[PDB]
Amino acid sequence: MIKQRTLKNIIRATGVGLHSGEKVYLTLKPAPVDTGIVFCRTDLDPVVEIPARAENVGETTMSTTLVKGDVKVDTVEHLLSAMAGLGIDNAYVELSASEVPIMDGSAGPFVFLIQSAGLQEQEAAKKFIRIKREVSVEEGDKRAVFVPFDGFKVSFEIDFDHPVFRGRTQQASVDFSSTSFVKEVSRARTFGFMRDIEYLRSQNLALGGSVENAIVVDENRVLNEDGLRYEDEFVKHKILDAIGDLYLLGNSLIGEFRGFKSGHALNNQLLRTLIADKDAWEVVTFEDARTAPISYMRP
Ligand SMILES: CS[C@@H](Cn1nnc2cc(C#Cc3ccc(Cn4ccnc4CO)cc3)ccc21)N(O)C=O
Ligand SMILES: [Zn+2]
Numbered sequence: 001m002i003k004q005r006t007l008k009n010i011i012r013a014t015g016v017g018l019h020s021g022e023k024v025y026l027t028l029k030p031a032p033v034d035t036g037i038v039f040c041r042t043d044l045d046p047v048v049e050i051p052a053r054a055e056n057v058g059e060t061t062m063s064t065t066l067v068k069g070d071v072k073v074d075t076v077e078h079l080l081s082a083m084a085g086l087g088i089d090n091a092y093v094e095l096s097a098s099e100v101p102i103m104d105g106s107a108g109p110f111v112f113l114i115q116s117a118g119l120q121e122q123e124a125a126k127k128f129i130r131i132k133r134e135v136s137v138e139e140g141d142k143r144a145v146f147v148p149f150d151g152f153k154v155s156f157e158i159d160f161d162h163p164v165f166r167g168r169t170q171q172a173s174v175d176f177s178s179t180s181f182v183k184e185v186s187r188a189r190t191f192g193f194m195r196d197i198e199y200l201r202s203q204n205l206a207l208g209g210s211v212e213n214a215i216v217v218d219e220n221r222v223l224n225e226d227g228l229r230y231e232d233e234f235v236k237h238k239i240l241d242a243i244g245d246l247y248l249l250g251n252s253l254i255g256e257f258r259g260f261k262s263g264h265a266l267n268n269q270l271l272r273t274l275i276a277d278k279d280a281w282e283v284v285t286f287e288d289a290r291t292a293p294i295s296y297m298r299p
Contacts, residue, residue, distance in 0.1 A: 002126045002286045004089040005299065006030045008118030013109070015101020018190070018214070019063065019074055021207025024097040028117060031090035033124040036250050037083055039066055039073045039093045052080055052093075054248040054271040060264040062205075064245055074099040077264065078190075081244035082110030085181030086119065087252065087296040089126055105189035105213040106229075107240055111182055119299035125285035128294070131255025133280040137269045142261045144270040146280070149256035150293040152176040154246075156238045156259045160193075164220050170235035178295040185243070187229045188236035191215035194223070242267055249275070251283065254293055 007030040014025050031038070037052035048071040050056050058067025059074075066073040079100050083091065085107065093100075103109035136145040141159075155173040162168070174180050192200070192214055200206040215233065216223040230236050238259060245267035246253050259267070274280060286292035 002289045002292050003121040004033055004124045004126045005087050006090040006120045006122060008120045011113050011117035013113055015103050016208035017099030018102035018206060018208040020099045022097045022099060024095055024099055024101045026101055027094040029092040031092050033122050035090040037091050041071055042094045043096050052076060052248060053250050054275055057268050060268045064264045072098045076100055077241050077244035078107050079110050080247040081240045082107040082114060084243045084247040085186060086111060086114050088114060102208055102213040107186045111186045121299050127251045128254050128284050129249050129251045129281050130284050132282055135274045135277050135280045137266060137273050139266055142266050144262040144266045145258045146274055147256040152253060152294055153256040154239045154242055156235050158235050158238055159261050164217060170232050172232050172235040172239055174239055178297045185236055185240050188233050188240050189215050190237055191217060191234050194218040
């Protein structure tokens with residue numbers, strides 16, 4: 001059987017919210033079978049619980065925000081990507097503030113935190129959502145699509161408005177084996193252009209941002225002293241974001257995602273459209289892991 005997974009132990013991290021600039025304490029707690037990823041705001045009385053599900057998304061401007069009443073959890077995409085990548089089904093994420101800490105701007109520190117706490121396989125079949133039919137959404141020149149594929153694959157194209165490393169676009173495609181996410185995606189940091197960042201800062205946004213958690217591109221040159229972790233780090237980061245948004249389906253996907261200048265807003269539109277189109281998907285489990293189209297690393 002491909003089994004559900006949780007953490008073996010509680011683990012803690014601290015960081016700053018990139019948007020809010022607030023110091024936040026993060027606790028990952030093990031959870032039992034069929035819990036899913038549940039976020040909680042520990043700083044509120046009573047404590048408020050928000051399942052990490054498409055129906056709980058309230059804002060998608062520059063990050064995915066979960067909302068329940070007037071209670072928000074901002075920037076869930078990078079932590080959710082790490083959980084998707086490692087195959088964590090069940091976890092409580094307890095936050096002392098309205099934003100997940102940015103860490104280094106990738107999923108790398110979250111996958112390390114999770115793999116340090118250890119993975120616990122549970123005595124229940126892991127649930128997958130299979131893409132049975134193509135589903136697509138467009139808005140102007142932007143496109144996001146689910147395509148049937150016996151496995152998990154994510155393609156992305158981004159269009160910069162000017163030349164960066166002497167071209168206007170980057171494309172990447174990752175056909176996932178057990179090991180692809182940690183090695184080729186997890187370390188891809190978020191990025192901003194200096195002129196955009198200057199504008200975001202003027203409007204009192206990106207208050208936690210720095211070279212320590214973001215690639216800063218001034219014109220066509222990277223300002224970060226040590227440069228890039230991958231040649232195509234920027235498009236690999238959009239693949240990271242997309243895997244985090246896809247996990248709001250609450251079950252691991254069997255199929256292909258393609259993004260063309262997509263972002264959190266259109267990614268979330270795709271998810272809502274797929275969820276509505278019940279003939280395009282079906283929940284499945286694998287009692288024989290050897291015949292399953294997706295493998296996870298050993299726990
Ligand atoms: C959760 S992140 C999101 C994409 N996203 N959205 N907003 C963002 C803001 C930034 C930033 C930044 C920043 C970097 C350095 C500095 C210091 N500074 C300024 C000028 N000169 C200096 C050097 O002294 C100031 C701000 C990066 C990515 C962003 N994402 O990936 C969603 O998925
Ligand atoms: Zn991101």
